[PDB]
Amino acid sequence: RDMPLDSDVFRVPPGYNAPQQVHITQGDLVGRAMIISWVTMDEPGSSAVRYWSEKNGRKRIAKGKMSTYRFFNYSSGFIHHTTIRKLKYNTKYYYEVGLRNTTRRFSFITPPQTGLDVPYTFGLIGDLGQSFDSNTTLSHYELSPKKGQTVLFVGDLSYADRYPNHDNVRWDTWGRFTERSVAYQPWIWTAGNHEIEFAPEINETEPFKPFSYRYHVPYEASQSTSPFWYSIKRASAHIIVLSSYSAYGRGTPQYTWLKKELRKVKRSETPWLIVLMHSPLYNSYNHHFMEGEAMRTKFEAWFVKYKVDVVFAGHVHAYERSERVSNIAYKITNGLCTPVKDQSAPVYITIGDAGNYGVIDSNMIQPQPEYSAFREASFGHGMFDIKNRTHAHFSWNRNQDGVAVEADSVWFFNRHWYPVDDST
Amino acid sequence: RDMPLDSDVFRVPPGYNAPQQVHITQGDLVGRAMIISWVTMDEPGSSAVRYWSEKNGRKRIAKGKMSTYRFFNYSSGFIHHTTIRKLKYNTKYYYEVGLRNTTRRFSFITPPQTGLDVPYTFGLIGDLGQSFDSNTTLSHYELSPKKGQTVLFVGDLSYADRYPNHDNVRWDTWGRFTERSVAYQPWIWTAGNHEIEFAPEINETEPFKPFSYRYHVPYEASQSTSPFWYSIKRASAHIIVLSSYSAYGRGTPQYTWLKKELRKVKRSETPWLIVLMHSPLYNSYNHHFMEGEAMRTKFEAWFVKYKVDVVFAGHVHAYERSERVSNIAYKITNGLCTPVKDQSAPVYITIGDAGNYGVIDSNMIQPQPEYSAFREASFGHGMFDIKNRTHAHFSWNRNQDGVAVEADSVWFFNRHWYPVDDST
Numbered sequence A, B: 001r002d003m004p005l006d007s008d009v010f011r012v013p014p015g016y017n018a019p020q021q022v023h024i025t026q027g028d029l030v031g032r033a034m035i036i037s038w039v040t041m042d043e044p045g046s047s048a049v050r051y052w053s054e055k056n057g058r059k060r061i062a063k064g065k066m067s068t069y070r071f072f073n074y075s076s077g078f079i080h081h082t083t084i085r086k087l088k089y090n091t092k093y094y095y096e097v098g099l100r101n102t103t104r105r106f107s108f109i110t111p112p113q114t115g116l117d118v119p120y121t122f123g124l125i126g127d128l129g130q131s132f133d134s135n136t137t138l139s140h141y142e143l144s145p146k147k148g149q150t151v152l153f154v155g156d157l158s159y160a161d162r163y164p165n166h167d168n169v170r171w172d173t174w175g176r177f178t179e180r181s182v183a184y185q186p187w188i189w190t191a192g193n194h195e196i197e198f199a200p201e202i203n204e205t206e207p208f209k210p211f212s213y214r215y216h217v218p219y220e221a222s223q224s225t226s227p228f229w230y231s232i233k234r235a236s237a238h239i240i241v242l243s244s245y246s247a248y249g250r251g252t253p254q255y256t257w258l259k260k261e262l263r264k265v266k267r268s269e270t271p272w273l274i275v276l277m278h279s280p281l282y283n284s285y286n287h288h289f290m291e292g293e294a295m296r297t298k299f300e301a302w303f304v305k306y307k308v309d310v311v312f313a314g315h316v317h318a319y320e321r322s323e324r325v326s327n328i329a330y331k332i333t334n335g336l337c338t339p340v341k342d343q344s345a346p347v348y349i350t351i352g353d354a355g356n357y358g359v360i361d362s363n364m365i366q367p368q369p370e371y372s373a374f375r376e377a378s379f380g381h382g383m384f385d386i387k388n389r390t391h392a393h394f395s396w397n398r399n400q401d402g403v404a405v406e407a408d409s410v411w412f413f414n415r416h417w418y419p420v421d422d423s424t
C-alpha cells in the first residue's frame, strides 16, 4: 500500500529543468562542510551551488560533478553532487541551486563546534519507504515539539526494489517525497538490505548501484575506502556507520577500518559514541531473528571494550529497546552463551518502524527475553536528545499518538562520564 | 625461512620471452575445458595455445587474452589467460605456449565424465607459501604412491604480502616454484586472507588485486558473479568454493548464490559434496580460534540440511579432523550451545599445514574438545581418494614421515548413499 504516483507529495516542482530530489548531508569529519545533491530531468544543467550566511551577505559559488546511470530499461536524470566546505559553525546558510535555469532556494544550519557539553538533538528513522504510514511518520518528526536538527537513517530507503525491475522511478518519487526535510537538515545514511539490489536476471550485478549514485557520503573524511561505512563527528557525538551487507571478516577493509576508528575516538572531545547499522545484533522478534549473529560474534566485544553508548538499527519493522547486555564469554564448549547484564555494554535499539510499504512486524518471540527492556509493534520514530556530557534523553513517538506524546522515554547515562545504572 | 631468490625452484626457464609461471585449472562446470595461464617477461607475445590429444594428432589453436597490472612501484609482466574447450573426457592432451618466440610444452589429462561411481583422487594443500618446508610438502605430493590428479587449494598462496610493499616479485617466484605441478594438473583455487592485500598506505585499496589478475577461475559456469566463490563438478564430486573474506550476509551476492547452488546439487549424478573455504568453522587451536564463528552461524545449518560430506579449510597452520557434529540448536536464550554429534553433518578438516613461511601453529585449546577427532602440529598435505559412491578414503601425510606413510587415515561413508557412522 504505497502512495500512488499522483500523490501530492510526489508532485514535481514547476519550472524548466527545476532542481528536484534535493538532499544534504555532512560533507566532512567535524561538521563544517555539506554535500548538496539534486536531480534535473530536462537537461544537464549547472552543478554550481550558490550559498551565503544569513549575516554575512557575501555570496559564494561552489562547483560540483554530475553523473547519470541506467538500471535495466531505466535511464536516470542528471544527478548533481557538490561539496560546500570551510563553513562557519552554528550559523544559518542559504543555498540556491539550478542557477542556469529555474532556480530554487533552501537553507540549513551548521552544527556548533564539537565539544564536551554541546547539546544536540538527533532524529532516528529507519525503513521509511513511501507508504501512507511513511508520510505520517515524517510529519510527526517535523511537528515534533523538540525540533530535530539531523536525522540518523538506519537503512532501507525507498523500497523501489519491490517493484518490477526495481522500477527506479520509485527512487525518484522517494527523492521528492523526502525533500521537504533532507533539503533543510542533514540525514546520515546507512545502507540497508533493500539497497543491495542485486538482480542477476536483469543483468544488474553491482551491489548498491542505484543507492550509491543517488546518495554520497563523506567516507573519505574518516580514512574509509568505501561509502558503506564511515564515521562523522557532530556536536558532542561521534557517529560510526557500519554496513551489515558488506564483508566484515578479519582482514577485510571494513573490519580493518572499524578497528582503527575505535582507537581514534576521544570521549573528552565527543562524549557520546553512537553506532549505526541496518541489521540489529539484539532482536526478540521472529522476523529476521538471529540474522545479526554473524556481525555480533565479530564486533560485540569491541563495542563493550570501547563502551559505546547506543547502537541503532532498523531492518525489523517495529520497535525494541534492550537492557545493557553482552554475550561475549562464549567459547564453544564452556556453556557460557546466555546474555548477561553488563554496565559496560551499549543499549541496542531497533527503530525500523518508520513505515516501509505499510507492513508492521507483530510476531515476536515469547516469552519476552530478559535482555529486552521494551518492545512494541507500532509505526513511529525516535529522538536522541543530548543535554550534557553525562545525560542524553531518548524517546519514541508512535503514529497513533499525538505529536508530543512519548510512548517510550529513557534517560541514557554516558558510559564514559556517568557510568551509573540507567535501567528502566 | 623462505627460500632465497637464487633457489633452484625459482629458476627462470631459458630462451627469449620463455613462458613462465605456467598453471592450469578447470575451465567449465563439467570438466571439458581448461584455463591455461602463463607469464612472459620480455615482451607481450601471443596468447595462443596449441593443443592436441595422444590419439587424434589433430593440432588446434585457441586464442586467449593478455593483461598487465601495477601494484606499488611494481610493474607486472604480460599475463595470459586462454580457455580451451570441447575437450574429450579422460584423454591425455599436449599443449604448447609461447608460439611466437621460444615455445614450451606441457600436458594434462582431462577427467572422466561425471558419474555415480567414478573414481578420482584429489590432493589437499593449504597455505603453501614458499619456504623450504613448502618445497618438501610439494615433493611428498608428487611422490605419493597413490597419485593425485587434481589439487584442492584451500587458501594463502604466496605470502608475498609479508614482504615490504607486498613485493609482488614474490608472486612471480611462487608462480615458477609451483609450475612443476600446476602446469600438469589442475588446482582449484580458494582465496585466503593473504590474498586480500588491502594496503591503503600504498594506495592499493582493491581487495584481491594481485591474486585476481594472476589466477582466473570458471566462476561464470556456475552462475556466480564473482571469482571468489563458485563451484565445479569433477568425476563423482561436486565442489563448492566459498570466500571467507567477502560479504556473506543475508541478501548479498555470495549468500544468494550459495543458497541456489545447494539446491542444484544432484547426489545421484555427483555423490560426493565437498566445500572449500579458507577459515575453518571448527577449530580447536588457539591461533584464529573462533574466527569462523561469523560464517558458521550463517551456513552451518545449510551444510547439514544438504548433508555435505567434507568441508576443507586452511588458515590455521596445522592439521585437525573433527567428528560429525553440529551446533545449530542455539536460540540465544535456550542454552543449547554445545556441539552435538550429528550423522547428517559434515566432517570438518583443516589442512593449512603445507608450509607457509616456515611457522607451524602448535598451541591448542586444552583439553582437546569432544568435537575434535584428531589434531597435530606438523607440516604435511592430504589426499581424498574416492572409490565408489559409498566409500572415499582420506589420508594425511606428514613431512617427517616417508612419502608413503599415512599418519592419519580415515574412511568416509557417503552421507547420501551410505549413511553409517564412520567415526574413528
Ligand SMILES: CC(=O)N[C@@H]1[C@@H](O)[C@H](O)[C@@H](CO)O[C@@H]1O
Residues within 6 Å of the ligand: B073, B074, B165
Ligand atoms: C620495484 C622497485 O622499484 N624497487 C624499489 C626497491 O628497490 C626499494 O628498496 C623500495 C623501497 O620502497 O622501492 C621499490 O620497491
Ligand SMILES: CC(=O)N[C@@H]1[C@@H](O)[C@H](O)[C@@H](CO)O[C@@H]1O
Residues within 6 Å of the ligand: B016, B017, B043, B045, B046, B100, B101, B102
Ligand atoms: C624473433 C622473435 O622471437 N621475435 C618475434 C617478433 O619478431 C614478433 O613481432 C613477435 C610477435 O608475436 O614474436 C616474437 O617476439
Ligand SMILES: *[C@@H]1O[C@H](CO)[C@@H](O)[C@H](O)[C@H]1NC(C)=O
Residues within 6 Å of the ligand: A073, A074, A165
Ligand atoms: C521496462 O521493461 C519492462 C519489461 O518487463 C516493461 O514492462 C516496462 O513497461 C518498461 N518500462 C519502460 C517505460 O521502459
Ligand SMILES: *[C@@H]1O[C@H](CO)[C@@H](O)[C@H](O)[C@H]1NC(C)=O
Residues within 6 Å of the ligand: A016, A045, A046, A100, A101, A102
Ligand atoms: C539552462 O542552462 C543551460 C546550461 O548553461 C543553458 O545552455 C540553457 O540555455 C539554459 N536554459 C534556459 C533556462 O534558457
Ligand SMILES: *[C@@H]1O[C@H](CO)[C@@H](O)[C@H](O)[C@H]1NC(C)=O
Residues within 6 Å of the ligand: A003, A007, A008, A009, A132, A135, A136, A139
Ligand atoms: C503527507 O503529509 C503532508 C503533511 O501532513 C500532507 O500535507 C499531505 O497531504 C500528505 N500526503 C499524503 C498522500 O498523505
Ligand SMILES: *[C@@H]1O[C@H](CO)[C@@H](O)[C@H](O)[C@H]1NC(C)=O
Residues within 6 Å of the ligand: A387, A388, A389, A390, A391
Ligand atoms: C544534565 O541534565 C540533567 C537533567 O537534564 C541535569 O540534572 C544534570 O545536572 C546535567 N548535567 C550537568 C551535571 O550539568
Ligand SMILES: *[C@@H]1O[C@H](CO)[C@@H](O)[C@H](O)[C@H]1NC(C)=O
Residues within 6 Å of the ligand: B003, B007, B008, B009, B132, B135, B136, B139
Ligand atoms: C626442492 O625439492 C626438489 C625435489 O622435489 C629438489 O630437487 C630441490 O633441490 C629442492 N629445492 C630446494 C631449494 O629445497
Ligand SMILES: *[C@@H]1O[C@H](CO)[C@@H](O)[C@H](O)[C@H]1NC(C)=O
Residues within 6 Å of the ligand: B387, B388, B389, B390, B391
Ligand atoms: C566401496 O569401496 C570399498 C573398498 O574400496 C568396497 O569394499 C565396497 O564394496 C565398495 N562399494 C561398492 C559400491 O562397490
Ligand SMILES: [Fe+3]
Residues within 6 Å of the ligand: A127, A155, A156, A194, A314, A315, A316, A317, A352, A356
Ligand atoms: Fe526494512
Ligand SMILES: [Fe+3]
Residues within 6 Å of the ligand: B127, B155, B156, B192, B194, B314, B315, B316, B317, B352, B356
Ligand atoms: Fe595461512
Ligand SMILES: [Zn+2]
Residues within 6 Å of the ligand: A127, A155, A156, A192, A193, A194, A278, A314, A315, A316
Ligand atoms: Zn531491512
Ligand SMILES: [Zn+2]
Residues within 6 Å of the ligand: B127, B155, B156, B192, B193, B194, B278, B314, B315, B316
Ligand atoms: Zn590464513
